[PDB]
Design a protein around this nucleic acid. Structure first.
Ligand SMILES: [Mg+2]
Length: 569
DNA sequence: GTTAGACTTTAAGT
DNA sequence: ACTTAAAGTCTAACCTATAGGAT
DNA sequence: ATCCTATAGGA
């Protein structure tokens, strides 16, 4: 049919939401109890697809409230009621207490513990069973063991037509072209913080230099050139006249600006973080494309006669649910350039009727969605995140992994290794077998760990592991194969122009440790036949960094236009 | 004010 | 007491070995 | 025969 998705075809802490204890951490000194990190499996309504049910996987930390207990024995007022859940011994079959001090809040104010989605790192079923896909696999198998096929949940696959994969070579070429485009423009870094003792400017310059891009450090920001400012945190300053950010950015209006904190330029291990450099550079490129109203790299072709509208949220107060008409900014492709203007009241009066039923994605609220419109016929196109998560085919991956664990449970006899050495004298795997047999002793068999010097890469190694498999010793196998395709719906650009629906994801090969699910996007329309060039609007690989994108390319350009207006009007 | 996208905790609406 | 949207946190943004097809 | 370029399994 196509890729898998959380949309539903047919319909353990024991409450609303099925918690699966994943991780436990011990508290610091002078405290008792364990912090819990948990995964929730729940069935929820859909906002974007006709109230058809959806699956939801979500981290729900549980902490002890003895952490919050004061020195005098009193307990802090932060949510001191109505939340009582605790664990017993095993991660399932637990209990609570209506006056229990073990709550759903984290250890701190708004700390967000997070859990991986898929883990097949050493293709270990134990590491797999501690990720969201693994928890969902456990959920399905527990439901199956509990009820037979009487109670079953069937994720609705997506009708798939145009599944445009992307390789690491294509994205690598896209970014070498991108940074080649940046080579034409002057780039400046300036550190403006108080008592510049952190030397973050040197680290950022050295990070840029390894992408072969020239940058020069100066004392103060320079007009005309692309600027990077290391300024302190936003809340460090109290007055907007003394904050270097936005005084240097309202002093100069027609100048491209990117700014950074010091702390962001280093990782946990102390080496430079080289991703920050790339994101800064490509974001400056996008802002420059916005600012000169052209394209510095070849974007695809947009649909003809289309217009892209996008609101912006004021810096004002309640109007309770932003009911007051926001400014709305429009973008059009005209010849060799783009036009960005503000949408007048007459245009939006026409639009709110021509868009009609689907007006309320552009108006009435926060997060007002950009929408394409067509002057010629009043047909339009809306791109909305549906809340649907799309999953790699978990049941097959777990079916493979359980058999891998069963195979590695046995120890290979010396007799089989001797037979394999005798019967295949020209294979390259023999030398490692002879060495590991000489290191071993002829009485006891070899466990799997001493095979760790032998990998499932070469063709003779593949033959060796298949030959071990025919004897019942299923040591290693193939899981992330493109030809066999279990880890799709997490890879590459997808497209269904009959229904506009799409998603993005990883590039090239799946990773053993992937921790986010892609989201399916819906293009609501009044069309009978959607324009073909809606394919082209987001076959671009640098909005999301080094990845396929879920939002059309003119929308980000319009948004970086809008954000550039805070210091002009 | 690394960013987009996904994601989780908190706060406002009911 | 429950709901849902708004506010805010946070992690990846791969890497290298092997076979195969082309020249 | 040899060098590049997909395939995907380890760090
Ligand atoms: Mg920004």
């Amino acid at each position: 049919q196509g890729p898998l998705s959380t949309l539903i075809e047919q319909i353990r802490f024991e409450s609303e939401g099925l918690y699966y204890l994943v991780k436990s951490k011990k508290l610091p000194k002078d405290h008792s109890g364990y912090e819990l990190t948990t995964v929730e499996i729940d069935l929820a309504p859909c906002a974007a697809l006709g109230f058809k049910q959806t699956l939801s996987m979500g981290t729900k930390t549980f902490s002890p409230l003895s952490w919050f207990t004061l020195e005098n024995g009193e307990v802090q007022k932060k949510a001191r009621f109505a939340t009582r859940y605790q664990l017993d011994d095993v991660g399932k079959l637990v209990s609570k207490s209506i006056k229990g001090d073990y709550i759903k809040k984290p250890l701190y104010s708004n700390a967000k513990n997070r859990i991986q989605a898929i883990d097949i790192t050493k293709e270990s079923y134990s590491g797999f069973q501690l990720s969201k896909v693994g928890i969902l696999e456990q959920f399905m198998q527990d439901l199956k063991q509990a009820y037979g096929d009487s109670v079953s949940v069937k994720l609705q696959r997506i009708p798939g037509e145009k599944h445009r994969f992307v390789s690491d070579t294509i994205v690598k070429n896209h970014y070498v072209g991108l940074f080649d485009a940046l080579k034409e423009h002057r780039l400046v870094i300036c550190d403006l913080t108080e008592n510049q003792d952190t030397d973050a400017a040197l680290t950022l310059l050295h990070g840029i230099e390894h992408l072969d891009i020239n940058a020069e450090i100066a004392e103060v920001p320079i007009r005309g050139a692309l600027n990077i400012l290391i300024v302190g945190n936003k809340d460090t300053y109290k007055s907007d006249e003394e904050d270097p950010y936005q005084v240097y950015r309202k002093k100069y209006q027609d100048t491209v600006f990117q700014s950074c904190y010091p702390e962001r330029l280093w990782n946990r291990q102390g080496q430079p973080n080289r991703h920050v450099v790339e994101v800064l550079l490509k974001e400056l490129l996008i802002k420059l494309e916005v600012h000169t109203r052209k394209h510095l790299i070849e974007y695809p072709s947009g649909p003809e006669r289309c217009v892209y509208y996008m609101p912006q949220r004021p810096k004002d107060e309640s109007s309770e649910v932003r009911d007051e008409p926001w400014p709305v900014y429009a973008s059009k492709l005209v010849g060799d350039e783009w036009q960005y203007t503000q949408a007048t009241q007459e245009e939006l009066e026409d639009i709110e009727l021509d868009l009609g039923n689907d007006k309320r994605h552009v108006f009435h609220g926060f997060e007002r969605s950009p929408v394409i419109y067509w002057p010629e016929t009043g047909d339009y196109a809306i791109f909305i995140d549906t809340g649907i998560q799309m999953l790699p085919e978990f049941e097959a991956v777990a079916e493979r992994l359980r058999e891998l664990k069963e195979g590695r449970s046995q120890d290979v006899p010396i007799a089989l290794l001797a037979q394999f050495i005798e019967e295949n004298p020209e294979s390259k795997v023999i030398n490692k077998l002879r060495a590991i047999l000489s290191e071993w002793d002829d009485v006891a068999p070899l466990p799997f760990d001493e095979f760790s010097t032998i990998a499932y890469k070469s063709s003779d190694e593949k033959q060796f592991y298949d030959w071990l498999r025919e004897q019942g010793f299923f040591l290693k196998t193939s899981i992330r194969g493109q030809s066999e395709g279990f880890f799709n719906a997490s890879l590459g650009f997808f497209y269904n122009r009959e229904q506009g629906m799409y998603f993005a994801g990883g590039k090239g090969s799946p990773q053993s440790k992937i921790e986010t699910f892609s989201h399916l996007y819906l293009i609501k329309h009044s069309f009978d036949a959607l324009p073909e060039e809606v394919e082209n609007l987001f076959d671009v690989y640098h909005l999301r960094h080094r990845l396929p994108t879920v939002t059309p390319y003119p929308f980000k350009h319009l948004r970086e236009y809008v954000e550039m207006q805070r210091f002009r009007s």
